[PDB]
């Protein structure tokens, strides 16, 4: 029967490892394993947009961060707190979500399954695959690629307020470095990015009508959703993605993205602002796979005859990050 319960996590955390995900997982999670059973001739409706697993992962990562990444100062709901804010070792590890006795996880194995509606190739699993709880905006990093075709998913495409979650099927490497102070940069392939955009443009045309597709930058909100923001080595990187999202689609070299490491950030855990300590000294570098994207679509008046769809990098709600990995699973009570 469909059911909400308290899922527990499993991981490969090491007790002699001071890295903060390891320390957290050592107390919060069982050691990772795997068993998978195929359920014949069963068809089951899914809805990734209403999946309590997402809320649970959210609570866990909020708790992980709260214990691990202490801002020096936090302002929430007009109330101010200050506290010790030591630098930490920070590198996400894979986390699995598992059902306790009496419950099962159903998994949808349909190819290019969009996350809602009926699934005809269904299995049960003891745990999900291992998910790195990567916190970022605009770009989804270090996730899982689609096996077959590029996929776009939305709770309701006709509602432009609903974020569109893109799952790439071939990764795009992004190399980000702050050299030997708040200035940093990212590199990516101009050609790889163009191929990726081309595959997205194709899937979006399938969805909305082969209307002209345009990409434009984020514009209007918090630095967290205007820039590509992410955490590398404990530092909050904010990367200008204008060059990535400036494109028109109708009928070579490296891209270099300027970044800033910020101390004062708007929090994703809760409405408020937080200040962390300045960057550690020395080279700070992350090489990550872009495995997905978060987009929003512009709305309002457009041409009836030849509509053109405008897309911008989005994100902000990290629940969408988790659903981008959790979309094939649901929990049922047996």
């Amino acid at each position, epitope marked *: 029967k469909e059911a909400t319960t308290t899922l527990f996590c499993a991981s490969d955390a090491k007790a002699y490892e001071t890295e903060v995900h390891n320390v957290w997982a050592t107390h919060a999670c069982v050691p990772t394993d795997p068993q998978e059973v195929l359920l014949e001739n069963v068809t089951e409706n899914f809805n990734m947009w209403k999946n309590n697993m997402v809320e649970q992962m959210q609570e866990d990562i909020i708790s992980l961060w709260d214990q691990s990444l202490k801002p020096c100062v936090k302002l929430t709901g007009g109330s101010v707190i200050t506290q010790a804010c030591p630098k930490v070792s920070f590198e996400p590890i894979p986390i699995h979500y598992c059902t306790p006795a009496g419950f099962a996880i159903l998994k949808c194995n349909d190819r290019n399954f969009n996350g809602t509606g009926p699934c005809k190739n269904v299995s049960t699993v003891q745990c999900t695959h291992g998910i790195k709880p990567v916190v970022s905006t605009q770009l989804l990093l270090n996730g899982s690629l689609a096996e077959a075709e590029v996929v776009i998913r939305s709770e309701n495409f*006709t*509602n*432009n*307020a*609903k*974020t569109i979650i893109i799952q790439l099927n071939e990764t795009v490497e992004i190399n980000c470095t702050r050299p030997n102070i708040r200035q940093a940069h990212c590199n990516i392939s101009r050609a790889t990015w163009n191929s990726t955009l081309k595959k997205i443009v194709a899937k979006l045309r399938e969805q909305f009508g082969n209307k002209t597709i345009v990409f*434009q930058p*984020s*514009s*209007g*909100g918090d630095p967290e*959703i*205007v820039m590509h923001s992410f955490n590398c080595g404990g530092e909050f990187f904010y990367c200008n993605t204008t060059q990535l999202f400036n494109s028109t689609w109708n009928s070579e070299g490296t891209i270099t993205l300027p970044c800033r490491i910020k101390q004062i950030i708007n929090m994703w855990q809760e409405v408020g602002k937080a200040m962390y300590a300045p960057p550690i000294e020395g080279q700070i570098r992350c090489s990550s796979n872009i495995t997905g994207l978060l987009l*929003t*679509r*512009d*709305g*309002g*008046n*457009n*041409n*009836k005859t030849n509509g053109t769809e405008i897309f*911008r*990098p*989005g*994100g*902000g*709600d990290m629940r969408d990050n988790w659903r981008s990995e959790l979309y094939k699973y649901k929990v049922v009570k047996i």
Partner: antibody, heavy 126, light 114 residues
Framework: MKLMQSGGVMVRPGESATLSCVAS????????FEWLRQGPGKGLQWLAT???????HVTASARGRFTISRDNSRRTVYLQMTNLQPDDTAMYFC?????????????????????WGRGAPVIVSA | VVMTQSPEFLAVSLGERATLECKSS????????????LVWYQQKPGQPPKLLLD????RRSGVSDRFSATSASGRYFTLTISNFRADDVATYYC?????????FGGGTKVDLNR
């Protein structure tokens, strides 16, 4: 909230003219502005839009003849008219449209106008 | 996108009710807001037009409650002026703002019966 217009203008056929509009009392940074045309014994007609990102649309009957632009530092909006003709004789309105910003970053645009300039007569004649 | 109003001229008596009609060739329903993207302006002679109502039925702030409006099928719209008085004599324009470009109703001139 005020839009103070600048006109009007008198001009021989074929000549060019410029109209301006200056915004105060709100946030120029986050609004688009448009130019509307009213004929004598008329009659309302949209001419051009500039969005808050300085994207510009012009009606096709005037495309490559009219041009809209925007100076954010001075909170000013402009209409450049070229090769003006006696037909073009009318009252020109500066107007603020609607720009709606969402939490996830989406932006809706709606071209209706809560805010109107005083209107500026452009008369074209030999 | 064609907007048609009717009648062209409308005479109303000094306490009665004006009923102005506006017809769109297309649906102006804006699905994500579940609102019709249609708007009503008042224009007196010499003045810029004033925005009375937006999304078909919503009075603007400051606008008299004697003004109200109606939408059906995302295509047919009615503007109503109760307690018609001297200062309601004007041209009323409807405007669609669902599609680009925005297009104007062509106007209804309301004057005082007598």
């Amino acid at each position: 909230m005020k839009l103070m217009q600048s006109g009007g203008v008198m001009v021989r056929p074929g000549e060019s003219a410029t109209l301006s509009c200056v915004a105060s009392g709100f946030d120029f940074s986050r609004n688009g502005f448009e130019w509307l045309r009213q004929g004598p014994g008329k009659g309302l007609q949209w001419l051009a839009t500039v969005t808050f990102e300085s994207k510009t649309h012009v009606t096709a009957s005037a495309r490559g003849r009219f041009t809209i632009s925007r100076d954010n530092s001075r909170r000013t909006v402009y209409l450049q008219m070229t090769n003006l003709q006696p037909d073009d004789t009318a009252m020109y309105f500066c107007v603020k449209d609607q720009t709606i910003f969402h939490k996830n970053g989406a932006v809706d645009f709606f071209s209706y106008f809560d805010l109107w300039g005083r209107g500026a007569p452009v008369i074209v004649s030999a | 996108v064609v907007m048609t109003q009717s009648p062209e001229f409308l005479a109303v008596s000094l306490g009665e009710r004006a009923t102005l009609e506006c017809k769109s060739s297309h649906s102006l329903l804006y699905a994500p807001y579940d609102k019709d993207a249609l708007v009503w302006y008042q224009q007196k002679p010499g003045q810029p037009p004033k925005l009375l109502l937006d999304w078909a039925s919503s009075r603007r702030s400051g606008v008299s409650d004697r003004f109200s409006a109606t939408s059906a099928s995302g295509r047919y719209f009615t503007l109503t002026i109760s307690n018609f008085r001297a200062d309601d004599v004007a041209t009323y324009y409807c405007q669609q703002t669902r599609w680009t470009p925005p297009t104007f109703g062509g106007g209804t001139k309301v004057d005082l019966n007598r």
